[PDB]
Design a protein around this ligand. Structure first.
Ligand code: SF4
Ligand code: SF4
Ligand code: SF4
Ligand code: CL
Lengths: 728, 141, 138, 80, 53, 40, 68, 739, 30
């Protein structure tokens, strides 16, 4: 069979364009030859199994490599002074100067220092040795196999689920909430009280004896009665030493609040109590919708009920709109997953749950930067598939006059306003920055415009941070909120008022401007993506755009010119802005924490209000150790990052080629090369099986953006790690 | 009630720098005057003035006063310009007067924008400010 | 089928390649009143013979490029030109002008194609024709 | 190959046919408009999709429409 | 100018006067002759002195 | 001549007339009353 | 029917002038599909990239117009 | 040979108040905002304004008169600022301790800090234009002299402006008059350059040389007599140069040997000022003068004597080139674009020569000392020359599309070239790829060997070395030339070739510029980037008319975005789009040339000189060991030398810190236009328009997204600005700090 | 023999998820 098998249109393409476009369309199952709706879902369902197995096979990889080539057993003896190892290094191109550099972390051979923070995670959950790790790698190896066989099984005729089975939203929700979320949470609470909490108190519990040692002196007697107070009997003391019995208690379910004083992380007894409480409220949550017993709701029925005088038809037929369109479903999922992924980033740097991780500055920097980038991708994609929905699945008849339709009905008002807010932020936020630069540059920094984050400062005050002295709610000992009373509060108030962690960092003028620069970035990225979706079906410049689909090169140079006019081109443009937003964002987090970790917060506080300060103090100054990874004198452990740094700058700039110079130049240049080949003697016997052509108009946009993105993260990643690993 | 900030006159970081303030203009005492003038503001540990925009009338001159002064001038510009853009339409050769100004007509409208807020509330309450949606160019939904 | 005289031309690099002998090539004939210079679509100056000419070119678009030049760049206008597609099979097929008259001029005898008894903004919604190979303009 | 379609808004000014550089289009008799003729696309196999026809059309929104399709040696415009 | 230098140049004026009747593609046209003769005689007298050392 | 008058009334001549006048006002005010970061 | 000079509102919805108002320039005899020629105060997008203007006239059917 | 029309156009102000009158499309009036951009993009396109070659020539002629007028106003303002806003006289009295400054900034909003201390009790901006060094050598020793020159510059500006009007509204030359090439050639050679070079030789010998001879003796300026009493009192001239003691000059005796006193061939630098001897540059100009008066007597005019260029060209045919230069005289006398294409290529290539020659052979006093002026003048004339040799590629293609005739070019050089264009571009294509690998791929090899801890594997002088065998050899012959192959030349033309390391004050004016492996690599980078720039621009000329993709590209024009999404995509096929892509490579190429210069001069040349002769270079010779890796350039050049400009806030150099960031901004701004398309932007404007329609504030001139071409034009206009402004601020702040 | 022969065996049981990925791959292809 001629590749691609799924598109006869592409298979006939006599040019090289066949190969590329075959790869770019392999996963758009909807556009395949003779694809039905039932066979679509069944193919997605099987594909999902194969994806899960790749995940478990990846974690097994880290678990196995830590156990095999890592110093995990030595690291748990002194997690504050030993560097955790990622994996071994096997490179025949290494020279003497290089082998001596990467021989580090006490290892006798060349290794890499791990920055994923998995050491801290494994340790905290009760991993003690390289035998539990390895045993963990194998279990996730057979679990993966479990799913790879399942996907194979459900493609067999006897097991193929019906289309009615995939469209059953009621039953999928009841199970995902009560089972996948609830029981899973209840099962982690079980692990925490059985393994993590005990093994943190020196008492080993594992597959050997767990079935014959209770996690508490009492044994489920207070539970089935109503005296749950006993499980919060004797907490771990302030002087508890993690890993040993010195200061350990007996409580399993506490609500202490704040951090463990040694490990500077949340109390396992709080973490345990958390997943227990959440489990319950998730199980009852999975009883909402109707199944085979009359009780429950129809989402359809309750959705159709919410209509009011100002929104016309309300939410009528929205059940079917969603349940019929996967791009709609995929959009909500990506949008939501992308927000909480940000929430993960924001909560894991300010409220660590892993012992001794708040001391590992590099991992804390990587893990935050990492998850924000992931979050940024998810948000673009959410809007991307949002636009695709309007192009391929939206039905104006069933959706007539409801809230979805009315978005389009006043799409002008939305886009123009979103455009104003962006212009509003952009003109002024840049305005103050450039005022300050000039003002400072003329030796008069006292003339700067420095606005106090009163609103954000006031927010901290309401949670008990008395530094600003607003005296409100929790920073008010007389308030009703402080006398509520007690429970978590003493631990929490101590946590928030020690300027020793990253819990509600003190904020000033520097923080005021960056947040507004960030707001510019969220509005503009949303301006692009939302416009790309609302105008996906048509504009005055192209009223029949929907007939052309989501992605297409353009509509010729007629009617003024129509370059980058498709919804796909709105995603492509938006990507540049999301990267930009993350840049400002991650720049902010890093430069501010560098000050924290140095006890020198005065640097960011006093120089972040003008942009030369960012350029001078953050970018130029912290590149010092990075760019010296290698030089005419020697080579140190930062050699890679130095080399990767350039590699990043290179890829980035190679992207400008595919982005600035467009096709026609290259199609002509190729023809001369094709001429040269056919005219060169001896080299004529070799005839290509595929006619060489220049990349397509869309292809070059995509490729150019891919370089730009790979260059963007690899460059910064090499800077974040090296600068923080060097300076600590 | 911001504990972190302190008045510039009682701020040591400011007082030390304050006497080294550079001369902005050709006035040899301009740096001295600034020192005395910013002294009534709140300062950070660095000794630079910080502005309060939460609405405190005790800092009305930090944002409220320059806000009113802007919106008066900005609305003046916007109103007069719109006033002119609508009147040249009746000349049935408007495209040109947008590229080569009817100065006598322009100046006439500029010197009348000093009362634009009363003009704007008037046109609104007579249906002359905003147009129906149905009577406006629109793209396909 | 038919032929003519090759234009007196020194030769260029912009000419035919292996596509001509394996896939297809194209031929244009025409009639000239005199010996006069014309621009080669493949770059370079050539001169046409008085009488019938025969020139082979790589693409159909190249033939029509000369054809338009012949009809517009000479005070005695040339409109007698005929475009053919020559296969390596030896098969020659006639192309332009299709039915004798230029397509610019409506002619009774031609078959309507690609026509739609419908405004462009009266195509069906893409949702209504899901999972059928057809697009709205079909 | 590409798809070229004509809609009943055609006034029959022939401006598209004489714009086409590959002789894809032609005029045929029709009783829809004053000019008593409509554009037609009987040779789409030779269409490259340059959209010169669409640029030339005068009707509010186009009466002729090129939807790019399966690429061939002809529509890619390869002289090799 | 000296006798030798002097005459040494008129010989070159007669040289150019001969070379122009040779190849040429008129009273005003004799101005060009008197011009080339001088420059042609300048490389001589300076060469004669420079070469003699 | 009235042709000259129309040239001086062209958009670019007139915008650089307003920007220059506006600039002169801003400068001259900051000459007599420098360093106003806020209303006293 | 519609006379010359009548100011007319466009309802086509694929039209650059939908929602805008035009002027009835002339009506052609039946049975053409779109016999009413309308003139517009401001041009559309029509024209190759770089053009300083567009088209100010188009044909419509009487069913897709609304007198003003 | 003069023919003229009388009063072809009345002098009326009515056209002024009618923008876009010059074009049929625009004269109507504006309907969209595109009308406004088009009015600007076509104001000088005289070709598209009329088909009468007589009328455009008349426009072009009086066009230059206006250009010469503004350049005079520019120049006059330079002399005026040096005459009433500078410390020139202060610097003239103490050349070695004072820094040259002009333009003093007003004290407002605290900008007065830019008036740095330049010594001598003066405050202002330190200039790098070199005006002070030129004025001293030219003979200025007073403010009044500069002031008089400024007034004279305004007079001449007026006369250029008068001539321009007069030669379009009163007495317009006929096309016949412009086509007098042989006559025009004879006059520019002998009249402009010839007498010009002779006239200045008269100034140098009478004014510059004697005055400049006293300044090097430490006489001061005010004690030196004015240039007038050197002529009025010939005995004074006799006191300095003995040979000048002869009242009635026997220059006609042909006994030229006696003038050996002031017409020398020292061929070196003045040890006092570090500049070329004014006697050398005087004997120089006197020598060039004659060659030019001579050369301007070649072409035939009104006396039968001379040449016909038409006959010369046509009579040059070969077995390989068919009819040869036939018809070239015709296209060079009927197409201005043909003329502009050649003149740009040579003028641009010349301005680059000026750069490479002026630094190694400092013609001006105390110029070599000022490393800022040295770095400023060199990269200036580098950029200028580069822009011009990119327009040469634009007008080369505009000629092919507009003024080229197949009937007038049959089997000649021009036609033959078009018929193997595919062979040309295909071979250059391979050459560029060869140069990209064997030059850049050396650096990538180095960075990698360095990072793998394998320094002995790198390409370097201390490892496997790529010595420039050939270039070193010419340096040998240049310093061995004095005495042997240059008997009458005392010293070498430039000490960069080798020889003595001269020094003025305590700094180095010029010393032997040795060449090693580090030089070998960048010289092949310079070869690489230049070949690629050629490829793009050349390919733009040859395929201007047609390609295998677009056979009828000439009907589409010189400047058009594409021919639609068809044929796989035909974006940027036009000759204009080749000039566009070429502008980036001109930038990329010259940027590495000016970087090569800055590092090489600081690291291996410039520096101070202790009493014992030892030289302490600015960058301590880190070039030969760091200039061979990208990390080295990133670190030891950019990161290191940028320390100055980013640490400029609070000093007189603060302006340079500000512009450094500005260049960065507009660069990033440019990427908005280069990465997007007007399709998106037009649809956006539709939403914004609706809002104005909602409030009855929609303008009559409907808003339109920029054209596809303009998007690109804007795009490259900002990319080039920022990138150059950035480096300007970087170079300036860096060199002003070293001294 | 905890982490000595443990490098082996782990490779044997890794053939299962590989082999089952190959059977799933050929079914998704069809
Ligand atoms: S793409 Fe290159 S071509 Fe297809 S349109 Fe936007 S521009 Fe005219
Ligand atoms: S152009 Fe728009 S209209 Fe004139 S013909 Fe080809 S189609 Fe019918
Ligand atoms: S597209 Fe370029 S080709 Fe296919 S038709 Fe309209 S024009 Fe003739
Ligand atoms: Cl290095």
């Amino acid at each position: 069979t001629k590749f691609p098998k799924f598109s006869q249109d592409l298979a006939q393409d006599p040019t090289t364009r066949r190969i590329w476009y075959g790869i770019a369309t392999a996963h758009d199952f909807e556009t395949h030859d003779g694809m039905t709706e039932e066979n679509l879902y069944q193919k997605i369902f099987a594909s999902h199994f194969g994806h899960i197995a790749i995940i478990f096979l990846w974690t097994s990889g880290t678990l196995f490599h830590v156990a095999w080539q890592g110093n995990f057993e030595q690291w748990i003896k002194d997690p504050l002074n030993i560097r955790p190892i990622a994996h071994a290094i096997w490179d025949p191109h290494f020279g003497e100067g290089a082998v001596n550099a990467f021989t580090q972390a006490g290892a006798s051979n060349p290794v890499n220092i791990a920055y994923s923070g998995v050491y801290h995670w494994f340790y905290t959950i009760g991993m003690t040795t390289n035998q539990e790790l390895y045993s963990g790698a194998v279990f996730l190896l057979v679990l993966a196999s479990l799913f790879l066989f399942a996907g194979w099984l459900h493609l067999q005729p006897k097991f193929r689920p019906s289309l009615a089975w995939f469209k059953n939203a009621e039953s999928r929700l009841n199970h995902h909430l009560a089972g996948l979320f609830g029981v899973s949470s209840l099962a982690w609470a079980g692990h925490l009280v059985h393994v993590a909490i005990p093994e943190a108190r020196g008492q080993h519990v594992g597959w050997d004896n767990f079935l014959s040692t209770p996690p508490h002196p009492a044994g489920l007697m207070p539970f089935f009665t109503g005296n749950w107070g006993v499980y919060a009997a004797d907490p771990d003391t302030a002087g508890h030493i993690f890993g040993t019995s010195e200061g350990a208690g007996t409580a399993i379910l506490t609500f202490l609040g704040g951090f463990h004083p040694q490990t500077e992380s949340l109390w396992l007894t709080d973490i345990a109590h958390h997943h227990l409480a959440i489990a319950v409220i998730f199980i009852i949550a999975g009883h909402m919708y109707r199944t085979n017993w009359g009780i429950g709701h129809s989402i359809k029925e309750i959705l159709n009920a919410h209509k009011g005088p100002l929104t016309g038809a309300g939410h009528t037929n929205l059940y079917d709109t969603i349940n019929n369109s996967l791009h709609f479903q995929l959009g909500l999922a990506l949008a939501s997953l992308g927000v909480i992924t940000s929430l993960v980033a924001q909560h894991m740097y300010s409220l660590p749950s892993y012992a001794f991780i708040a001391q590992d500055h590099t991992t804390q920097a990587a893990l935050y930067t990492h998850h924000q980038y992931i979050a940024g991708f998810l948000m673009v994609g959410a809007f991307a598939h949002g636009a695709i929905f309007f192009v391929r699945d939206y039905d104006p008849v069933a959706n007539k006059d409801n809230v979805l339709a009315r978005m389009l009905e006043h799409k002008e008002a939305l886009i123009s306003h979103l455009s104003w807010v962006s212009l509003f932020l952009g003109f002024h936020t840049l305005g103050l920055y450039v005022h300050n630069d000039v003002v400072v540059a003329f030796g008069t920094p006292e003339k700067q415009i420095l606005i106090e984050p009163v609103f954000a400062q006031w927010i901290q005050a309401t949670s008990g941070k008395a530094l600003y002295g607003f005296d409100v709610l929790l920073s008010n000992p007389d308030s009703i909120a402080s006398t509520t009373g007690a429970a978590w509060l003493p631990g929490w108030l101590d946590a928030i008022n020690s300027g020793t962690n990253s819990l509600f960092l003190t904020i000033g003028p520097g923080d005021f401007l960056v947040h507004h620069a960030i707001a510019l970035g969220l509005h503009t990225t949303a301006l692009i993506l939302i416009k790309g979706a609302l105008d996906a079906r048509g504009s005055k410049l192209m009223p029949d755009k929907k007939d052309f689909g989501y992605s297409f090169p353009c509509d010729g140079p007629g009617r003024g010119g129509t370059c980058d006019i498709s919804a796909w081109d709105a995603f492509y443009l938006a990507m540049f802005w999301m990267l930009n937003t993350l840049g400002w964002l991650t720049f902010y987090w890093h430069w501010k924490h560098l000050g924290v970790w140095s006890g020198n917060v005065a640097q960011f506080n006093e120089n972040s209000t003008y942009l030369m300060g960012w350029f001078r103090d953050y970018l130029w100054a912290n590149s010092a150790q990075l760019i010296n990874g290698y030089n005419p004198y020697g080579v140190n452990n930062l050699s890679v990052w130095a080399w990767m740094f350039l590699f990043g700058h290179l890829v980035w700039a190679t992207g400008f080629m595919f982005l600035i110079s467009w096709r026609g130049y290259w199609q002509e240049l190729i023809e001369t090369i094709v001429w040269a080949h056919e005219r060169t003697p001896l080299a004529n016997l070799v005839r290509w099986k595929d006619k060489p052509v220049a990349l397509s108009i869309v292809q070059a946009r995509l490729v150019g953006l891919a370089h730009f993105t790979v260059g963007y993260v690899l460059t910064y990643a090499a800077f974040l790690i090296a600068s923080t690993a060097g300076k600590f | 009630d911001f504990a972190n900030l302190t008045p510039c006159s009682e701020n040591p970081a400011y007082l030390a720098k304050s006497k080294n303030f550079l001369n902005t203009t050709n006035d040899p005492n301009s740096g001295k005057i600034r020192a005395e003038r910013y002294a009534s503001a709140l300062c950070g540990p660095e000794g630079y003035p910080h502005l309060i925009v939460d609405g405190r009338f005790t800092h009305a001159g930090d944002f409220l006063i320059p806000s009113i002064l802007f919106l008066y001038i900005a609305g003046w510009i916007g109103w007069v310009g719109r006033s002119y853009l609508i009147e040249i339409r009746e000349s049935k050769n408007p495209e040109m007067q947008e590229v080569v100004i009817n100065v006598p007509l322009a100046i006439k409208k500029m010197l009348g924008g000093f009362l634009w807020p009363l003009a704007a509330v008037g046109e609104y309450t007579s249906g002359k400010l905003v147009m129906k949606d149905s009577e406006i160019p629109t793209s396909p939904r | 089928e038919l032929s003519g005289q090759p234009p007196k031309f020194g030769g260029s690099t912009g000419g035919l390649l292996s596509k001509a002998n394996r896939e297809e090539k194209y031929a244009i004939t025409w009639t000239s009143a005199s010996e006069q210079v014309f621009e080669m679509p493949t770059g370079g100056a050539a001169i046409m013979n008085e009488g019938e000419n025969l020139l082979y070119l790589a693409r159909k678009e190249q033939c029509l490029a000369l054809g338009t030049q012949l009809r517009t760049k000479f005070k005695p206008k040339i409109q007698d030109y005929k475009i053919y597609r020559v296969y390596p099979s030896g098969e020659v097929q006639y192309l332009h002008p299709a039915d004798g008259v230029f397509p610019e001029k409506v002619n009774e005898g031609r078959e309507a194609q690609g026509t739609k008894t419908r405004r462009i903004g009266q195509n069906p919604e893409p949702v209504t024709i899901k999972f059928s190979g057809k697009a709205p303009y079909e | 190959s590409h798809s070229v379609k004509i809609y009943d808004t055609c006034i029959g000014c022939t401006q598209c046919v004489r714009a086409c550089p590959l002789d894809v289009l032609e005029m045929v008799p029709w009783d829809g408009c004053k000019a008593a003729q409509i554009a037609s696309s009987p040779r789409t196999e030779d269409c490259v999709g340059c959209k010169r026809c669409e640029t030339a059309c005068p009707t509010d929104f186009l009466s002729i429409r090129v939807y790019l399709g399966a690429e061939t040696t002809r529509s890619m415009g390869l002289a090799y | 100018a000296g006798w030798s230098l002097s005459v040494g140049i008129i010989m070159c004026l007669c040289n150019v006067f001969a070379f122009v009747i040779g190849y040429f593609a008129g009273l005003p046209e004799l101005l060009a002759t008197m011009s080339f003769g001088h420059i042609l005689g300048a490389g001589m007298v300076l060469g004669l002195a420079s070469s003699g050392i | 001549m009235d042709g000259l008058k129309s040239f001086l009334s062209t958009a670019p001549v007139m915008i650089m007339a307003l920007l220059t006048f506006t600039a002169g006002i801003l400068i001259e005010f900051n000459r007599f009353y420098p360093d106003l970061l806020f209303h006293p | 029917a519609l006379n010359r000079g009548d100011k007319v509102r466009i309802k086509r919805t694929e039209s650059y002038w939908y929602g805008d108002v035009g002027t009835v320039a002339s009506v052609e005899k039946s049975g053409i599909l779109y016999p009413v020629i309308v003139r517009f105060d401001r041009v559309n997008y029509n024209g190759f990239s770089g053009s300083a203007s567009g088209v100010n006239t188009n044909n419509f059917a009487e069913n897709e117009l609304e007198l003003v | 040979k003069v023919s003229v029309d009388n009063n072809p156009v009345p002098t009326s102000f009515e056209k002024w108040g009618k923008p876009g009158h010059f074009d049929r499309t625009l004269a109507r009036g504006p309907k969209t905002t595109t009308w406004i951009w088009n009015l600007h993009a076509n104001a000088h396109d005289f070709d598209s304004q009329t088909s009468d070659l007589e009328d455009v020539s008349r426009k072009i002629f009086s066009a230059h008169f206006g250009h010469l007028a503004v350049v005079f106003v520019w120049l006059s303002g330079m002399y005026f600022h040096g005459a009433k806003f500078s410390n020139y006289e202060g610097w003239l009295a103490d050349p070695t301790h004072i820094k040259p400054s002009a333009q003093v900034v007003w004290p407002i909003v605290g900008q007065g800090i830019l008036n740095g201390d330049v010594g001598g009790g003066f405050h202002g901006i330190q200039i790098t234009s070199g005006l002070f060094y030129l004025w001293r050598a030219s003979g200025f020793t007073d403010s009044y002299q500069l002031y008089c020159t400024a007034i004279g510059g305004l007079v001449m500006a007026a006369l250029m402006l008068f001539a321009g009007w007069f030669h379009y509204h009163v007495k317009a030359p006929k096309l016949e008059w412009f086509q007098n090439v042989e006559s025009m050639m004879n006059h520019h050679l002998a009249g402009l350059l010839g007498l010009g070079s002779l006239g200045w030789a008269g100034h140098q010998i009478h004014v510059s040389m004697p005055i400049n001879k006293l300044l090097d003796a430490g006489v001061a300026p005010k004690d030196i007599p004015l240039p007038h009493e050197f002529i009025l009192e010939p005995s004074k001239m006799a006191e300095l140069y003995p040979s000048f003691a002869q009242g009635l000059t026997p220059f006609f005796t042909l006994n030229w040997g006696v003038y050996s006193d002031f017409l020398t061939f020292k061929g070196g630098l003045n040890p006092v000022t570090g500049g070329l001897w004014l006697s050398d540059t005087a004997h120089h100009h006197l020598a060039i003068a004659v060659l030019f008066i001579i050369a301007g007597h070649m072409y035939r005019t009104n006396w039968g004597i001379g040449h016909s260029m038409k006959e010369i060209l046509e009579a040059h045919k070969g077995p390989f080139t068919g009819e040869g230069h036939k018809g070239l005289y015709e296209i060079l006398t009927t197409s201005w674009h043909a003329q502009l294409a050649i003149n740009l290529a040579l003028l641009g290539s010349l301005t680059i020569i000026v750069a490479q020659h002026m630094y190694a052979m400092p013609p001006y006093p105390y110029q070599a000392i000022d490393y800022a002026t040295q770095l400023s003048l060199f990269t200036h004339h580098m950029w200028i020359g580069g822009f011009l040799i990119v327009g040469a590629g634009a007008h080369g293609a505009i000629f092919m599309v507009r003024d080229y005739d197949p009937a007038k070019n049959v089997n000649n050089l021009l036609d033959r070239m078009l018929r193997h264009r595919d062979a040309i571009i295909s071979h250059l294509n391979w050459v560029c790829i060869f140069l990209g690998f064997h030059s850049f791929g050396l650096y990538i090899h180095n960075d990698t060997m360095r990072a793998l801890g394998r320094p002995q594997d790198m390409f370097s002088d201390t490892a496997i070395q790529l010595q420039p065998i050939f270039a070193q050899w010419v340096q040998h012959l240049h310093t061995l030339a004095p005495g042997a192959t240059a008997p009458n030349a005392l010293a070498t033309a430039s000490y960069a070739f080798g020889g003595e390391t001269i020094a003025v004050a305590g700094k180095v004016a010029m010393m032997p510029i040795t060449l090693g492996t580090a030089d070998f690599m960048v010289h092949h980078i310079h070869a690489f980037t230049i070949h690629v720039t050629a490829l793009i621009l050349l390919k733009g000329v040859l395929y201007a008319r047609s390609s295998r993709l677009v056979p009828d590209k000439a009907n589409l024009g010189f400047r058009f975005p594409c021919d639609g999404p068809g044929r796989g995509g035909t974006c940027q096929v036009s000759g204009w789009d080749h000039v566009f892509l070429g502008l980036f490579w001109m930038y990329n190429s010259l940027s590495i040339v000016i970087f090569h210069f800055s590092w090489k001069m600081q690291s291996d040349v410039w520096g101070t000189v202790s009493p014992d002769g030892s030289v302490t270079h600015v960058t301590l010779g880190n070039f030969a060991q760091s200039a061979i890796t990208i990390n080295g350039w990133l670190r030891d050049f950019l990161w290191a030398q940028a320390a100055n400009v980013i640490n400029s806030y609070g000093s007189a150099l603060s302006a340079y810190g500000i512009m450094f960031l500005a260049g960065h901004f507009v660069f990033a701004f440019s990427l908005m236009f280069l990465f997007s398309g007007r399709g998106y932007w037009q649809e956006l404007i539709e939403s914004i328009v609706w809002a104005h329609n909602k409030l009855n504030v929609a303008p009559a001139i409907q808003p339109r997204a920029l054209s596809i071409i303009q998007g690109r034009a804007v795009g490259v206009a900002h990319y080039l600005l920022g990138g150059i402004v950035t480096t300007w601020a970087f170079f300036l702040a860096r060199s002003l700090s070293i001294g | 023999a905890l982490s000595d022969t443990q490098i082996l065996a782990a490779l044997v049981v890794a053939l299962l998820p590989a082999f089952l990925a190959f059977r799933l791959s050929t079914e998704l292809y069809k």
